[PDB]
Amino acid sequence: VRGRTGNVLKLKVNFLPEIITLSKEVRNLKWLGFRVPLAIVNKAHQANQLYPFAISLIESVRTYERTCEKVEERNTISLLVAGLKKEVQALIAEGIALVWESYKLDPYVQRLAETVFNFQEKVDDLLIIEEKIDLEVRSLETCMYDHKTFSEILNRVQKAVDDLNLHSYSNLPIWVNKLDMEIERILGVRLQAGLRAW
């Protein structure tokens, strides 16, 4: 249950404050074998047998939060990663769907980690690209008498469309239109100074 940008909520594996008690059973059941009751031993042992996969889910959630907050900072990133994100989050939603299942836990843990790392690379890459483009929007008022830059921007958006063809996205024309919005705005300011030169 989270309240932040985009008005969405996070996905946190609850083993985060539980690994403290898991490590407690490791110390108190391996070092000396303290008076740990059977209910605690059974429940936290069923959690301790999943402990490496539980901490892997914890850190997959760390990457999930680190990139989903980036997704909620700008919906353009959401619509960017959207196609691969559909398969990524489809396998993730399948792992979220199965609740209290020791049989389907570990393979969906690996599915969650692989898909969240794919989503992590795509979201972080597209956010770094968008942050550099935003810094360019804040730093592109020192140019005059240029056509190669116009052809370069068109070729860059053409290469972005090629990247969209490689990593087939569901919301592909939406990002194509957003790239065209970047084209029209950047070339509008640049061509306005160009018209002053005209």
Binding site: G6, N7, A93, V99
Partner: peptide
């Protein structure tokens, strides 16, 4: 992640 998060919460229950 809004529509997918709502669907994932629905699948979570």
């Amino acid at each position: 992640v809004f529509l997918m998060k709502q669907q994932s919460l629905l699948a979570k229950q």
